[PDB]
Amino acid sequence: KFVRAESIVAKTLATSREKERIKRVSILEDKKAKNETQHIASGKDFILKITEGLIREKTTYDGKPALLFIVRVRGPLAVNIPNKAFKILSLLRLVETNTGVFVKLTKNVYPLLKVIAPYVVIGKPSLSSIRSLIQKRGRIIVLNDNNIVEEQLGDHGIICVEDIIHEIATMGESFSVCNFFLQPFKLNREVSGFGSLNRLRKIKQREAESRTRQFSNAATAPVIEVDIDSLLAKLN
Amino acid sequence: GAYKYLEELQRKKQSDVLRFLQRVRVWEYRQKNVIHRAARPTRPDKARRLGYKAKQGFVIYRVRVRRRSLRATAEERVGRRAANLRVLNSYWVNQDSTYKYFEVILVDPQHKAIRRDARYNWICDPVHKHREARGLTATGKKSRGINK
Amino acid sequence: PEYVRVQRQKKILSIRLKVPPTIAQFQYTLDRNTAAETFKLFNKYRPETAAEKKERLTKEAAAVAEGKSKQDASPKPYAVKYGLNHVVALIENKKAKLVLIANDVDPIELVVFLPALCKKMGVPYAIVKGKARLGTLVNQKTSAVAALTEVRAEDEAALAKLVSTIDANFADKYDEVKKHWGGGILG
Amino acid sequence: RNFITRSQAVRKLQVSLADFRRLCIFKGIYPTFYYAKDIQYLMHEPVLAKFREHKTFARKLTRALGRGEVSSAKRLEENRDSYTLDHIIKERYPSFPDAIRDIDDALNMLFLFSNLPSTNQVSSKIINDAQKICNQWLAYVAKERLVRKVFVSIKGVYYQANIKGEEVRWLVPFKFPENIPSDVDFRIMLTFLEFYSTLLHFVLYKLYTDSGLIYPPKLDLKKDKIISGLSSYILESRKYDSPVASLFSAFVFYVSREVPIDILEFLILSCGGNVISEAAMDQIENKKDIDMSKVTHQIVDRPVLKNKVAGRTYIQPQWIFDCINKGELVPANKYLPGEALPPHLSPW
Amino acid sequence: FAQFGDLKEVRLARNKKTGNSRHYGFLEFVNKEDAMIAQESMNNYLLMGHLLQVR
Amino acid sequence: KNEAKRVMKIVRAIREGRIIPPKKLKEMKEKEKIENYQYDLPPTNEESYNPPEEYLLSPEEKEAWENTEYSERERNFIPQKYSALRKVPGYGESIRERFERSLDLY
C-alpha cells in the first residue's frame, strides 16, 4: 500500500524523542551506579503515587525488595520500540499487549523502570488482587511441561497453588521459581472496542489515562504508581 | 445579503448559465409528474419577495401546464389538489415549447406556527379559502385589472 | 423506482451537454490531504452547540444565583461562520480570512457568484466538495458555505500557511481550466 | 393459531430477534411455536418501549459520533433512562415464599459468575456485582447460622439451607481458573444473570429487613484486603435452632494455608467458630503470632506436620464436612492425618 | 519515490558542523516518464503543515 | 446583551425556584439512585465425589461411554474418580451444563 508521507514524520520524531530520553536515562543511571555524581540532576530517586485534579504524592525510594505487578499499557501514539526497551520487555515477556507479570523490586531491577516507564504502569498490589488474578487467570506451558515443573516445584516444596499466592506475597523462599512458573499472563481489553456505545468508553478512558500517565522524559522521572486494586477491578 | 445576487443573476435569464439551468431543469421536471412537491424553492429570492418563509407550514409545489391565464390555471390546479392548503401566490420558473412550469407557494392554516405568529394568522380566516378560485391572487387581480 | 431512475439519469445529461465554464469550476476541487488539514483546522473551531450553549448558560445563571454571586468579564468566542447571507456579509468588508464553498447545491445559482466574488475581492476561497460535511463541522445537516474571520494566535501561522497552500493548489492549478467549457462528452 | 412463528411474533412486535429472546426469557414466555394470547400480553410492556428507544438512542449516538461532537454524546449517555426489571419481578412472584422456592436456580448462576473470570464479553462490573451479592448472601447465611446439609464434589459444593423454613439448594464451584468454552453464547446467561440478580437482590432486601438489620452491608476495606469473602462485610443490628446452628459453640479453629480457605471458613462461620488462616496472617498488619491461647484444633491436609503440638488437635477437613452432615460430633481418629478416610456419602 | 518506481539515485543537501537539515534534496529515477509523474503529483504537496515543491 | 437577558431570565426563575441548580440536581440524582434501589417489598449420592467405591465402574467402561453420543457423554462423564482433597480437575463441564440448562428453560 501507499502508506503515507505523514506518519513517517511522527514516528521519526517520536524515535528521536525516545532515543534522547533513554540516552539521558543511560547517562544518569551509569553515573549513579558508578558513584560519579559531579554534575547531575539528583543523587537519589523518587516514586510517584496518584490517588483520589487528583492527589499525587511522592516518596523517596527504599532499597527494599518489594513485590510489584507490572501492567503493560499501549505505547505512545506513533512510536516504534527502540531495541533497548524491546530487549527489556522480551526479558519480562511484556510483548502481546494487555500482559502483566509479578516482579521483585530491588536496586538492580530499579533503573530499568525508567527504561520501560512510557510503556507500562507500576503499583502496590494486595493479596485479594493477586488471589483473584491467579485463581481467575494464569496458564502454564503446554502439555508435559506444565506437569514436570510441578514436580521440580515440589522439590522446592510448593503444593496447592494457594501456597504460590502465599510465597509470591511472602517472597521468603523462592520468587524466581514461581515467577518462571507463571511465565505467560493475559488480561482482557477493558473495552470491547468497536461499536456505538463502546467508542464513548474508548474516548473516556483515553482522556482518563492521559490524565493519569505522565511522560517525564527527564531521566529523574519519579516512578509513577497506581492503585492496582482499581486497575484490576477494571481489568479483572 | 446574497439574495440580491440571486435577483440580478435571474435578471439575465437568456444568458448561457441560466439558459443551461433552464434546459436541464425543464428535462428533469419533464421526467416528473404534472404536479409534485419541491423540497426548497428554486428561486428563493422570488419566493421571499412574494412572501415565502422557510418554516413548517409553507409548502412548495411545482406545477406543469400546457401552453383564463396559464398562471391562474396552474394556481387553480393546486387549489383543487391541496384543498387543505391555501394558495398564497405563484411565480414563473421554467418553460418549454410544450409546457410552462410554475412554482406555487401554499400555506397550511392548521399548523400552529401559521396559526400563531400573527404576521400570517390572517390567512387562517375562512374568507381567504381558495383565493385562486375567485381571482384574488396576484394574477387574478392582474387579469381582472384592478388598480388605480 | 421513478426517482432512482431520475437521479441515475441526472449527472448523465449534464456531462452529455456542455456545462458553462461558470460551472465545472465546481468539481475541480481541493485535493485529499489539503481538505483533510482544512477540516482538522476547523474542528478546533467548531461552533458551540445549542446543548453546550445551554449548559454554559445554566452554569453562569447558577453562578449569578449565589448571594455571594460572582461577576466576571470573559473574552470573545472563536468559531467558523456558516450562514449564506452572513457569509456574503463577512465578504464585502472584508473579514473572511477563509471561505469554503460546497459543490453540490441543488439551487447552484445560490453559489455561482461566490468564486468570482472572492476572486475579485481577493478572499482566499476554496471549493470544498460535499455540503453535508460542512454541516457536520457546524452542528447542521448542511451548510453549503463555511467562512472564518477571527483566529487565535495559536493557529494564525497555520491559517496563513494554509492560505498560501490553497493559493498554490487551487488558484494556480485550475485557473486555466476554470477558463474553459466543461462537459459536452456523451454518456 | 395456537402456534405463531417466531418471525411472525417478532415482526408483529417490531423488535430484534435477540431482544425477542431476551423478552421471552425475561417474562418466562415459553413455546418457533408460541401462544397467541401470551404474545398479546406481550404487546404492551414499558420495557419493550424502553428497548426500542434504546435502539433509537444507539442510532442517535452513531449520529453524534459520526458528527464528531463528543459533549452531546456524553449528555445523552448521562441523561439516559435505564430499563428496570422490578415490576415483572413483583407480578411474576407476588408471593414471597414462591420467590424463596424459585431462588434455588437464581443463586446458582450468580455463584458461577462470581467464579467466572473477566472476559471481553462479560464486563468486570458484572462479575463485581455477582461476587459482591454472593458474598452478601453468604454473610446472611452466616448470620443466623442455619444450614444442615454439606457436600464435597468435583462438581461443586452442594449446600442446602433452610430460609423461612424452606430448604434451598445452592453450590459454589471451586475458585480455579476455568478454560472459557467457545461453544457457549453469553447472550443467554447474561439475561439470566440480570433477571436473577434483580430477583435475588430484592429477596435479600426482604430477608435482611425481616432479620431486622441494615440491608446494604458495610465492609472494612482493609478487612476486604485480608480476604474477599463473606467475612469482609460487617453486619449491623438495626435462639438458634439446635444442634447444627451453634454447633461447635465456643469452638476455635486453626485453618491452615494448605487447606481451601473459602468453603471451610464458610462452614466454620455456619458453625459460629473462629477462623484463623496463616495465609491471612502474613499480610494482616502486625499480628503474625498465635495471639489466642484458646486455639486447640488445626484443619490441615499434609503427611508431615512440623511443630506437632500435642495440645492442638489435628484433623483433615472431611471431619467438618461430616459432623454438620450428621449434626453431631464424631471421633477424629480417622480424621487425624495421614489416616485413610471413610467414604462419606452425604444424606440425599 | 521507489513506490512510484525504482530510482537510480537519491541525495539530500547537507550541513557540515551539525546534523540538521537544509530541507532540500535531489532525486534521480530510472525512467524520465516516471519522473514526470512523480513531479506532477508532488509539485504542491501539502505535508506536515507546509507545502513541498518538486521540479 | 441578549445572552445577558436570557441569563437574568434564568436567574429570576431559579430565585423563584422554578429551576434547580445543576449541582443540586446532581446531588438529588446521587441520593435518589441509592434510595430507589433501596426500597422494595438428588443424584449426588449416586455420584461418588469423596474416595468412594462406585466410580470404580467409571474406568472400566470408559471407552464405552466415550463411544456414545455427546448428549449421552456429558451425563456419562459426570462420574470420574475422586483421588483426594488436594486435586479438583477444574470444572470443564459445568459451564456447558449450565448453558444447556438455560437453553432447556428457553
Added chain:
RNA sequence: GUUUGACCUCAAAUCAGGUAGGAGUACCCGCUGAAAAGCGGAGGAAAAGAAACCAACCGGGAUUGCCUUAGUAACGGCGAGUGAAGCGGCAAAAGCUCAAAUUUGAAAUCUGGUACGGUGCCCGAGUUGUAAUUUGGAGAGGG
C-alpha cells in the same frame, strides 16, 4: 476501507394529530356563455382598499355607497340610440406588514412529544434563514 458513516432523495405505515368534499346559495366574487342557462368559491356581508392616483388649480389626497356632475363628454350604416369620468355636498372613516445591506459578542426562532393556556426536559424544523429592528412619511449606527 470489499467496511463503516455523513447527507440528499424516495417509499412504506391499521404510527400521532389535523384538514378537503356534500346541502343551500336572496346578496357577493371569478370562468364560460347563447337565443339567461351552466361551472367554480366563500362570507355575514363579499369585493375593493391605502396611488407607478386625480388634476393644472390659490391644487386634492385609501377604498366603499348616495345626490349632483348628466342624459353632458365621448361613441354610434354619428342611424336605432349607447353612454362615462374629475371636482363638489353627504354617510362612514384606519391605517398598516414584507421582500433590500450581519446578531455574529453566541437561532436569540418555532411545531411536536412528555411531567406538572404556561413552565421544565427531549425530539426535531431551521443558516438553501426562524427571531428582534427598518417599509421612504424614511430608516440605521453611534456620541
